[PDB]
Design a protein around this ligand. Structure first.
Ligand SMILES: Nc1ncnc2c1ncn2[C@@H]1O[C@H](COP(=O)(O)OP(=O)(O)CP(=O)(O)O)[C@@H](O)[C@H]1O
Ligand SMILES: Nc1ncnc2c1ncn2[C@@H]1O[C@H](COP(=O)(O)OP(=O)(O)CP(=O)(O)O)[C@@H](O)[C@H]1O
Ligand SMILES: [Mg+2]
Ligand SMILES: [Mg+2]
Ligand SMILES: [Mg+2]
Ligand SMILES: [Mg+2]
Lengths: 249, 253
């Protein structure tokens, strides 16, 4: 079925390796949507994962799906439009945030993830380029975007089975700590001068609150971060705890 | 769906925690079959199989066809069970054939068939994840070079930022095809009537496995056979022998 029979195509709002997101006006209603053209591999299922999860969720702080189309070589997702650009870009124009602003972005994000975690959904790609503003208001409104790294979480055996250990919701929480750290400072807590180094940094949980940025940061803000950047997932603060943390109160 | 309308039930062919398998005769045609009765999960509860796991078993069998793997004929379902009607394999489990008796050649005759089956499956990016004697069946137990079919696909699967990424994703290695290869290693080895990593506790057994604590005991062994096992029973997955390699191995070609 032909998407050009229902929507008038606008110009791009984003890119990635195998996806273009362009603005799109619905012929019948005049309403504008964000169309995600995901080019299918010609020789996916990751695309049905993404769709089925987008179909399940509805929350003020997550993006809604509207319809889904398929052509010869792209599979198309008509999605809730979000017009205020990326928190990433708001984060660039602002160089960092006061605690009061960080907390009011962070409250919304927390709420979106709470909701998701209540449905056993893990996002697995929480980061500013995937967080989006509605209107760029002095106290702006966010929507979580970019799904499908999102996943529903539930004697002869080989060594890598014997010590398996599956991934979970806790990975999201870790990203939230990394997001918060960036929110309050210029900076990215683990970045090294090379990818190798950054990966080593993340594994050894090797970060500091350097004075250049954190010299006046509240105890409560440091506490919140420290409690989320914790190597063993079972001791990381959960979504529920994070919403009660007195820095969020 | 209602299976007793179309099949006369037979003798129990085998059992498990969540399934029962019986011989049945297709009323239409006289032909015979193996009916795998799988208990459905009541709630999301750890008795029964989930609807998802049952579907994955059906899907994979639906897709495969090769002399060394087993076929799916039809699927029934009632309030309690998902019933899989499977190609019958009449000659018992490799487990029982081993209990009732191996020279290197007898063993080699079995292994190649297994290799052939696993090579087929891998080529479809299906890891089996439960290769063991009780999941290998013989077409007939009374011939000098028994033929085999791999069965029991209940665990089988299809085989498919950094700054923000948690430590356990950084360190995450996915399970893939190499697991099957280790298992073949254990299988080859059981061909001695002896299991390479057995303990006294199931903890003892599990310690052994992840530490790679096997030896070729003089009591059992006494030469290219052991190179084959060794280049398989290896901790780091990515450096085990793959199914193509195992087939190019001099103990094989
Ligand atoms: N609903 C929406 N409203 C406005 N812009 C959106 C949007 N969904 C996506 N975008 C644009 O595209 C990006 C989000 O979806 P995304 O493009 O991340 O899918 P993706 O990450 O799979 C591309 P890739 O994986 O190839 O890098 C954002 O940076 C955004 O600018
Ligand atoms: N197609 C077939 N032909 C002949 N015999 C079969 C067969 N499928 C199964 N059997 C016999 O019954 C047993 C049951 O099938 P299979 O047991 O391997 O599923 P399963 O092992 O996952 C049950 P559980 O997980 O609850 O232990 C086999 O070990 C075998 O003895
Ligand atoms: Mg993205
Ligand atoms: Mg993406
Ligand atoms: Mg079995
Ligand atoms: Mg099984």
């Amino acid at each position: 079925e032909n998407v050009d029979d229902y929507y008038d195509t606008g110009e791009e709002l984003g890119s990635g390796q195998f996806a273009v997101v362009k603005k799109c006006r619905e012929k019948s209603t005049g309403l504008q949507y964000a169309a995600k053209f995901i080019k299918k591999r010609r020789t996916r299922e990751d695309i049905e994962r993404e769709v089925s999860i987008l179909k399940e969720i509805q929350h003020p702080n997550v993006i809604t799906l509207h319809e889904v189309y398929e052509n010869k070589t792209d599979v198309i997702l008509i999605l809730e439009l979000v017009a205020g650009g990326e928190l990433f870009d708001f984060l660039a124009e602002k160089e960092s945030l006061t605690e009061e602003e960080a907390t009011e972005f962070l409250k919304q994000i927390l709420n979106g993830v709470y909701y998701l975690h209540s449905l056993q959904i893990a996002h697995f790609d929480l980061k500013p380029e995937n967080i989006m503003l509605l209107d760029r208001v002095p106290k702006p409104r966010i929507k979580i975007i970019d799904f499908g790294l999102a996943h529903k979480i539930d004697e002869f055996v080989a060594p890598e089975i014997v010590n398996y250990e599956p991934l979970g919701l806790e990975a999201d929480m870790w990203s939230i700590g990394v997001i918060t750290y960036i929110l309050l400072s210029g900076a990215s807590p683990f970045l090294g001068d090379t990818k190798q180094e950054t990966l080593a940094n993340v594994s050894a949980v090797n970060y500091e609150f350097e004075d250049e940025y954190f010299s006046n940061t509240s105890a409560l803000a440091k506490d919140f971060i420290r409690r989320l950047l914790v190597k063993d997932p079972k001791k990381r603060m959960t979504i529920q705890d994070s919403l009660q943390h007195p820095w969020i109160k």
